[PDB]
Short mmCIF file of C-alpha atoms and ligand atoms in Angstrom, two decimals:
data_model
loop_
_atom_site.label_atom_id
_atom_site.label_comp_id
_atom_site.label_asym_id
_atom_site.label_seq_id
_atom_site.Cartn_x
_atom_site.Cartn_y
_atom_site.Cartn_z
CA UNK A 1 10.77 9.19 -22.35
CA UNK A 2 11.70 5.71 -21.14
CA UNK A 3 13.41 4.53 -17.99
CA UNK A 4 15.05 1.33 -16.91
CA UNK A 5 13.36 -0.25 -13.90
CA UNK A 6 16.47 0.88 -11.98
CA UNK A 7 15.89 4.53 -12.91
CA UNK A 8 12.42 4.25 -11.53
CA UNK A 9 13.54 2.58 -8.29
CA UNK A 10 16.00 5.45 -7.68
CA UNK A 11 13.29 8.14 -8.19
CA UNK A 12 11.27 6.28 -5.60
CA UNK A 13 14.36 5.98 -3.43
CA UNK A 14 14.48 2.24 -3.10
CA UNK A 15 16.68 1.10 -0.17
CA UNK A 16 20.22 0.30 -1.36
CA UNK A 17 22.35 -2.63 -0.28
CA UNK A 18 19.23 -4.89 -0.54
CA UNK A 19 18.45 -7.17 -3.47
CA UNK A 20 15.79 -9.42 -2.03
CA UNK A 21 18.04 -12.36 -1.14
CA UNK A 22 16.20 -14.90 1.03
CA UNK A 23 12.90 -13.83 -0.49
CA UNK A 24 10.73 -15.59 -3.07
CA UNK A 25 8.39 -13.53 -5.29
CA UNK A 26 5.53 -15.37 -6.87
CA UNK A 27 4.20 -13.87 -10.17
CA UNK A 28 0.77 -15.05 -11.44
CA UNK A 29 0.42 -15.61 -15.19
CA UNK A 30 -2.68 -16.48 -17.26
CA UNK A 31 -1.00 -17.03 -20.58
CA UNK A 32 2.15 -16.74 -22.67
CA UNK A 33 5.64 -17.45 -21.58
CA UNK A 34 9.20 -16.25 -21.32
CA UNK A 35 12.52 -17.46 -22.61
CA UNK A 36 15.22 -18.08 -20.05
CA UNK A 37 16.73 -13.47 -23.56
CA UNK A 38 15.73 -12.73 -19.93
CA UNK A 39 19.33 -13.31 -18.74
CA UNK A 40 20.47 -11.17 -21.70
CA UNK A 41 18.27 -8.33 -20.66
CA UNK A 42 19.47 -8.41 -17.00
CA UNK A 43 22.99 -8.62 -18.31
CA UNK A 44 22.28 -5.47 -20.35
CA UNK A 45 21.18 -3.78 -17.14
CA UNK A 46 24.31 -4.76 -15.29
CA UNK A 47 22.44 -6.85 -12.67
CA UNK A 48 22.66 -10.64 -12.12
CA UNK A 49 19.76 -12.60 -13.67
CA UNK A 50 17.85 -14.03 -10.72
CA UNK A 51 16.71 -17.63 -10.42
CA UNK A 52 13.30 -18.04 -12.16
CA UNK A 53 11.36 -21.26 -11.83
CA UNK A 54 8.03 -21.83 -13.63
CA UNK A 55 5.13 -23.72 -12.19
CA UNK A 56 2.42 -25.60 -14.06
CA UNK A 57 -1.14 -24.98 -12.82
CA UNK A 58 -4.40 -26.56 -14.19
CA UNK A 59 -2.33 -27.96 -17.06
CA UNK A 60 -0.79 -24.70 -18.16
CA UNK A 61 2.85 -23.84 -18.40
CA UNK A 62 5.55 -21.54 -19.64
CA UNK A 63 4.72 -21.32 -23.38
CA UNK A 64 5.76 -18.10 -25.16
CA UNK A 65 3.39 -17.36 -28.10
CA UNK A 66 5.86 -15.17 -29.97
CA UNK A 67 3.47 -12.16 -29.98
CA UNK A 68 4.86 -9.22 -27.96
CA UNK A 69 1.28 -7.90 -27.97
CA UNK A 70 -0.10 -11.03 -26.28
CA UNK A 71 0.35 -12.40 -22.78
CA UNK A 72 4.09 -12.78 -23.42
CA UNK A 73 4.20 -9.02 -23.04
CA UNK A 74 2.65 -9.33 -19.58
CA UNK A 75 4.80 -12.24 -18.43
CA UNK A 76 8.21 -10.85 -19.46
CA UNK A 77 7.40 -7.26 -18.32
CA UNK A 78 6.44 -8.72 -14.97
CA UNK A 79 9.57 -10.80 -14.57
CA UNK A 80 11.85 -8.03 -15.88
CA UNK A 81 10.61 -5.30 -13.62
CA UNK A 82 10.66 -7.18 -10.31
CA UNK A 83 13.74 -9.20 -11.27
CA UNK A 84 15.87 -6.20 -12.19
CA UNK A 85 15.12 -4.69 -8.78
CA UNK A 86 15.07 -7.79 -6.58
CA UNK A 87 17.75 -9.85 -8.39
CA UNK A 88 18.74 -11.70 -5.23
CA UNK A 89 15.15 -12.97 -4.90
CA UNK A 90 14.02 -16.30 -6.30
CA UNK A 91 11.15 -15.94 -8.82
CA UNK A 92 8.31 -18.45 -8.90
CA UNK A 93 6.09 -18.02 -11.98
CA UNK A 94 2.69 -19.73 -11.79
CA UNK A 95 1.09 -20.38 -15.20
CA UNK A 96 -2.67 -21.19 -15.26
CA UNK A 97 -5.42 -21.13 -17.91
CA UNK A 98 -6.87 -17.65 -18.41
CA UNK A 99 -10.06 -18.23 -16.44
CA UNK A 100 -11.97 -17.92 -13.19
CA UNK A 101 -10.63 -21.29 -11.96
CA UNK A 102 -7.04 -21.14 -13.24
CA UNK A 103 -6.63 -17.61 -11.84
CA UNK A 104 -7.87 -18.68 -8.41
CA UNK A 105 -5.96 -21.88 -8.63
CA UNK A 106 -2.69 -20.18 -9.55
CA UNK A 107 -3.10 -17.83 -6.57
CA UNK A 108 -4.01 -20.59 -4.13
CA UNK A 109 -1.05 -22.66 -5.42
CA UNK A 110 1.47 -19.84 -4.91
CA UNK A 111 0.24 -18.83 -1.55
CA UNK A 112 0.33 -22.32 -0.14
CA UNK A 113 3.42 -23.57 -2.05
CA UNK A 114 5.46 -25.60 0.50
CA UNK A 115 8.51 -25.79 -1.70
CA UNK A 116 8.99 -22.23 -2.87
CA UNK A 117 7.07 -20.31 -0.06
CA UNK A 118 6.90 -16.93 -1.77
CA UNK A 119 6.61 -14.09 0.74
CA UNK A 120 5.19 -11.79 -2.02
CA UNK A 121 2.59 -12.38 -4.75
CA UNK A 122 2.51 -9.94 -7.69
CA UNK A 123 -0.55 -9.93 -9.93
CA UNK A 124 -0.97 -8.06 -13.19
CA UNK A 125 -4.30 -9.57 -14.44
CA UNK A 126 -7.99 -8.87 -13.61
CA UNK A 127 -11.42 -7.62 -14.91
CA UNK A 128 -14.27 -5.30 -13.72
CA UNK A 129 -15.27 -6.55 -10.30
CA UNK A 130 -18.90 -6.75 -11.47
CA UNK A 131 -17.75 -9.24 -14.11
CA UNK A 132 -16.68 -12.00 -11.71
CA UNK A 133 -18.97 -14.76 -10.45
CA UNK A 134 -20.17 -14.51 -6.87
CA UNK A 135 -18.37 -17.70 -6.11
CA UNK A 136 -15.09 -16.61 -7.71
CA UNK A 137 -15.12 -13.44 -5.81
CA UNK A 138 -15.55 -15.07 -2.47
CA UNK A 139 -13.01 -17.75 -3.20
CA UNK A 140 -10.46 -15.19 -4.44
CA UNK A 141 -10.94 -13.13 -1.27
CA UNK A 142 -10.56 -16.05 1.05
CA UNK A 143 -7.36 -16.88 -0.83
CA UNK A 144 -6.11 -13.34 -0.15
CA UNK A 145 -7.12 -13.62 3.47
CA UNK A 146 -5.15 -16.84 3.71
CA UNK A 147 -2.22 -14.96 2.22
CA UNK A 148 -2.38 -12.29 4.95
CA UNK A 149 -2.42 -15.01 7.65
CA UNK A 150 0.77 -16.63 6.18
CA UNK A 151 2.51 -13.24 6.03
CA UNK A 152 2.38 -12.97 2.23
CA UNK A 153 2.05 -9.56 0.55
CA UNK A 154 -0.35 -9.69 -2.38
CA UNK A 155 -0.08 -6.78 -4.84
CA UNK A 156 -2.43 -6.24 -7.82
CA UNK A 157 -2.39 -3.81 -10.79
CA UNK A 158 -5.51 -1.58 -10.65
CA UNK A 159 -6.30 -1.49 -14.42
CA UNK A 160 -5.30 0.38 -17.58
CA UNK A 161 -8.70 1.67 -18.75
CA UNK A 162 -9.36 4.53 -16.37
CA UNK A 163 -12.36 4.94 -14.08
CA UNK A 164 -14.58 2.87 -16.42
CA UNK A 165 -12.29 -0.19 -16.55
CA UNK A 166 -13.02 -0.89 -20.18
CA UNK A 167 -16.73 -1.29 -19.50
CA UNK A 168 -18.71 0.76 -22.00
CA UNK A 169 -22.08 0.82 -20.19
CA UNK A 170 -21.79 4.41 -19.09
CA UNK A 171 -20.95 3.57 -15.44
CA UNK A 172 -17.75 3.71 -13.34
CA UNK A 173 -16.11 0.38 -12.36
CA UNK A 174 -13.10 -0.80 -10.41
CA UNK A 175 -11.04 -3.87 -11.38
CA UNK A 176 -10.85 -7.12 -9.33
CA UNK A 177 -8.69 -8.36 -7.73
CA UNK A 178 -7.37 -4.82 -6.94
CA UNK A 179 -10.79 -4.03 -5.38
CA UNK A 180 -10.22 -6.73 -2.73
CA UNK A 181 -9.51 -5.03 0.62
CA UNK A 182 -6.87 -7.73 1.16
CA UNK A 183 -4.77 -6.72 -1.79
CA UNK A 184 -2.33 -3.80 -2.18
CA UNK A 185 -3.94 -2.12 -5.23
CA UNK A 186 -1.41 -0.42 -7.49
CA UNK A 187 -2.55 2.45 -9.71
CA UNK A 188 -0.56 4.47 -12.21
CA UNK A 189 1.26 7.68 -12.72
CA UNK A 190 3.18 9.70 -15.26
CA UNK A 191 6.68 10.16 -13.84
CA UNK A 192 9.22 12.82 -14.80
CA UNK A 193 12.39 12.24 -12.78
CA UNK A 194 16.14 12.77 -12.95
CA UNK A 195 19.08 13.03 -10.59
CA UNK A 196 17.10 10.60 -8.42
CA UNK A 197 14.64 13.43 -7.85
CA UNK A 198 10.99 13.49 -8.84
CA UNK A 199 10.38 16.59 -10.97
CA UNK A 200 6.74 15.84 -11.72
CA UNK A 201 4.33 12.98 -10.89
CA UNK A 202 0.70 13.00 -12.06
CA UNK A 203 -2.25 10.65 -12.70
CA UNK A 204 -1.64 8.47 -15.75
CA UNK A 205 -4.23 9.50 -18.33
CA UNK A 206 -3.60 9.34 -22.11
CA UNK A 207 -7.31 9.36 -22.93
CA UNK A 208 -9.49 6.71 -24.53
CA UNK A 209 -6.78 5.78 -26.97
CA UNK A 210 -3.69 5.51 -24.73
CA UNK A 211 -5.05 4.15 -21.41
CA UNK A 212 -5.36 5.61 -17.91
CA UNK A 213 -4.87 4.15 -14.42
CA UNK A 214 -7.90 2.42 -12.96
CA UNK A 215 -9.09 3.84 -9.62
CA UNK A 216 -12.39 4.39 -7.84
CA UNK A 217 -14.81 3.00 -5.21
CA UNK A 218 -16.00 -0.57 -5.01
CA UNK A 219 -19.71 -1.29 -5.05
CA UNK A 220 -19.16 -4.79 -3.67
CA UNK A 221 -16.62 -4.44 -0.90
CA UNK A 222 -17.38 -2.17 2.06
CA UNK A 223 -15.08 0.64 3.10
CA UNK A 224 -12.52 -1.09 5.38
CA UNK A 225 -11.88 0.23 8.91
CA UNK A 226 -8.38 1.21 8.10
CA UNK A 227 -9.60 3.35 5.18
CA UNK A 228 -11.89 5.40 7.33
CA UNK A 229 -9.57 8.34 7.64
CA UNK A 230 -8.72 8.51 3.97
CA UNK A 231 -11.61 10.66 2.66
CA UNK A 232 -12.77 7.97 0.21
CA UNK A 233 -15.96 9.23 -1.50
CA UNK A 234 -18.90 7.12 -2.42
CA UNK A 235 -18.80 5.54 -5.87
CA UNK A 236 -19.74 8.19 -8.44
CA UNK A 237 -22.44 5.86 -9.73
CA UNK A 238 -25.98 6.84 -8.81
CA UNK A 239 -27.38 5.48 -5.56
CA UNK A 240 -23.93 4.12 -4.63
CA UNK A 241 -22.87 3.53 -1.06
CA UNK A 242 -19.56 3.69 0.71
CA UNK A 243 -17.09 1.16 -0.64
CA UNK A 244 -13.41 0.14 -0.56
CA UNK A 245 -11.45 2.87 -2.39
CA UNK A 246 -9.01 1.86 -5.11
CA UNK A 247 -6.00 2.14 -5.24
CA UNK A 248 -3.68 2.14 -2.14
CA UNK A 249 -0.38 3.06 -3.85
CA UNK A 250 0.61 4.19 -7.37
CA UNK A 251 3.71 4.48 -9.58
CA UNK A 252 5.07 5.08 -13.08
CA UNK A 253 2.75 3.39 -15.62
CA UNK A 254 2.54 5.93 -18.50
CA UNK A 255 3.87 4.27 -21.64
CA UNK A 256 4.92 7.83 -22.76
CA UNK A 257 7.40 7.61 -19.87
CA UNK A 258 7.60 3.81 -19.77
CA UNK A 259 9.95 0.93 -19.06
CA UNK A 260 12.73 -0.29 -21.30
CA UNK A 261 12.16 -4.02 -21.58
CA UNK A 262 12.94 -6.87 -23.95
CA UNK A 263 9.73 -8.70 -25.07
CA UNK A 264 10.05 -11.76 -27.34
CA UNK A 265 13.71 -10.77 -28.15
CA UNK A 266 12.75 -7.26 -29.14
CA UNK A 267 13.79 -4.02 -27.45
CA UNK A 268 10.72 -1.93 -26.74
CA UNK A 269 9.17 0.51 -24.25
CA UNK A 270 6.06 -0.42 -22.22
CA UNK A 271 3.83 0.90 -19.42
CA UNK A 272 0.50 0.11 -17.72
CA UNK A 273 -0.36 -0.60 -14.06
CA UNK A 274 0.87 -4.07 -15.09
CA UNK A 275 4.42 -2.89 -14.25
CA UNK A 276 3.59 -1.27 -10.91
CA UNK A 277 2.72 -4.42 -8.89
CA UNK A 278 6.06 -6.07 -9.87
CA UNK A 279 7.82 -2.78 -9.05
CA UNK A 280 6.50 -2.60 -5.50
CA UNK A 281 6.87 -6.32 -5.06
CA UNK A 282 10.61 -5.84 -5.41
CA UNK A 283 10.37 -2.97 -2.91
CA UNK A 284 8.69 -5.22 -0.37
CA UNK A 285 11.23 -8.02 -0.79
CA UNK A 286 14.14 -5.65 -0.09
CA UNK A 287 12.32 -4.48 3.02
CA UNK A 288 11.59 -8.09 4.23
CA UNK A 289 15.26 -8.92 3.66
CA UNK A 290 16.42 -5.97 5.74
CA UNK A 291 13.89 -6.70 8.48
CA UNK A 292 14.63 -10.42 8.63
CA UNK A 293 10.90 -11.06 8.45
CA UNK A 294 8.04 -10.83 5.96
CA UNK A 295 5.86 -7.80 6.40
CA UNK A 296 2.88 -9.62 4.90
CA UNK A 297 -0.41 -7.69 4.79
CA UNK A 298 0.40 -4.04 4.66
CA UNK A 299 -2.77 -2.02 4.01
CA UNK A 300 -3.72 -1.40 7.70
CA UNK A 301 -0.16 -0.09 8.46
CA UNK A 302 0.19 1.99 5.31
CA UNK A 303 -2.90 4.06 6.13
CA UNK A 304 -1.66 4.59 9.68
CA UNK A 305 1.84 5.77 8.59
CA UNK A 306 2.94 9.45 8.42
CA UNK A 307 1.98 11.02 5.17
CA UNK A 308 5.55 11.99 4.43
CA UNK A 309 6.36 8.33 3.84
CA UNK A 310 4.69 8.82 0.43
CA UNK A 311 5.08 11.15 -2.52
CA UNK A 312 1.53 12.57 -2.92
CA UNK A 313 0.11 12.89 -6.45
CA UNK A 314 -2.36 15.75 -6.53
CA UNK A 315 -2.88 16.64 -10.16
CA UNK A 316 -4.90 14.93 -12.86
CA UNK A 317 -7.79 12.45 -13.18
CA UNK A 318 -8.38 8.86 -14.48
CA UNK A 319 -11.43 9.60 -16.69
CA UNK A 320 -11.22 8.41 -20.25
CA UNK A 321 -14.96 8.14 -20.83
CA UNK A 322 -16.22 11.62 -20.65
CA UNK A 323 -15.41 15.12 -19.46
CA UNK A 324 -16.61 14.94 -15.84
CA UNK A 325 -13.08 14.33 -14.50
CA UNK A 326 -14.10 11.29 -12.46
CA UNK A 327 -12.05 10.56 -10.47
CA UNK A 328 -9.69 13.44 -9.57
CA UNK A 329 -6.37 13.23 -7.75
CA UNK A 330 -6.10 15.54 -4.72
CA UNK A 331 -4.01 16.14 -1.54
CA UNK A 332 -3.87 12.88 0.44
CA UNK A 333 -5.57 9.61 -0.54
CA UNK A 334 -7.50 9.88 -3.85
CA UNK A 335 -9.23 7.39 -6.23
CA UNK A 336 -6.52 7.67 -8.93
CA UNK A 337 -3.21 7.12 -7.05
CA UNK A 338 -4.24 6.14 -3.48
CA UNK A 339 -1.66 7.23 -0.94
CA UNK A 340 0.74 8.12 -3.76
CA UNK A 341 4.14 6.61 -4.68
CA UNK A 342 6.09 5.08 -1.80
CA UNK A 343 9.47 6.61 -0.75
CA UNK A 344 11.42 3.39 -0.23
CA UNK A 345 13.88 4.45 2.38
CA UNK A 346 11.11 6.15 4.30
CA UNK A 347 8.78 3.11 4.20
CA UNK A 348 11.58 0.86 5.42
CA UNK A 349 12.45 3.25 8.21
CA UNK A 350 8.81 3.56 9.39
CA UNK A 351 8.68 -0.19 9.62
CA UNK A 352 12.02 -0.87 11.36
CA UNK A 353 11.90 -2.30 14.91
CA1 CA B 401 -3.18 12.43 -3.65
#
C-alpha cells in the first residue's frame, strides 16, 4: 500500500476549506536539497505548489546531492508532505551543517526569524538523547522554550529504530529532540484506511530490518506536570526513574503503507516518523488559519483534551531488539503512539473560542 499525503489527511479528518494561508512553516534541514520537480509533484496531486524559500545557516544551503537515499530524501519528503496539505502556507527551509551547532543554529534562526516568522517548526532529524552534549541539550531546550513563548509549535519525529533508537548497547533509548518536553513528539503507525475511514491503525514495527517507531521514557527529562495523568511508566531500563514519555501523537509512518513522493525526480514510496512531523505541521497551520491566531505550544492542552479528540492505537509494540515487547501500545497514552492520531476536525473544534 501507498497513499498520497491527501489520502492520509482525509483518514485523519483534516479540516477542509483551510490550506494554511497566512501561516509560515519552517522545516529544519541538516543536509541535501530540493529542486524547485517539487512544483511538478504538487501539480500531479492537483494542489498549487506553495511558496518555498530556502535559508542559509552556518554556511549551508539548498544543495541536492542526487542520492534519494541521502538527506535529499529527508528534505523533499518533508516539503512534499506538509506542502501538499498546507499549500497556502509559505515554506521556510533552513539548511545547516549536520552537527550539534548547525542543528541548534538552524532552530534558533527559524524561531527568531523576523522576516519569515514561521508559526510552526517541523523537525525530522535527531539522535539518542544520551548522545547529545550537556550543553547542546540545554541550548536546544531553551530554544524550544523560546519557541513556546513566541507562539511557535515545534514538532519532532520520534525516531525510526524502535525502542532502542539504533543504539546497540542492550538498553532502551528515546531520541532527542523528541524527548524535549517542549516539543510535540511524533511517533509512527501502520495505517489501513479507505472511504476516509480508518479500518486499522497499529504501532509501526517492521522488525530490525524495516524500522519501527521510536517511543519510550526519557532518562534525562522529568515527567512533566501535564503528563501526570497519562500513565507513563518508568523507563524500562534498570534503576530508571520517572521521565518524560515519548511520543505525544502518532501517525502513518510504515513504509509498507507509505507516502507517494517524488525524490530526486523519481517516483517512489517512503515512510518513517520523518513524515509525521510535516503531516501534523500542516494540520496545525490549518487550525491557526481558522482560529486567526497561532496555537503555539500544544502539549499541556492536548493532554487535557477529551480522549475522543484522538484515534487511540492500542495494538502492537515498538521493540525491534528483542522479544520482550518493550514498549507496548495500550488504551490511552502509551510509549509507542502517545495519545494516538489526531482527528483534525475534532482537534480544531476543541480549540475553537
Ligand atoms: Ca494507546
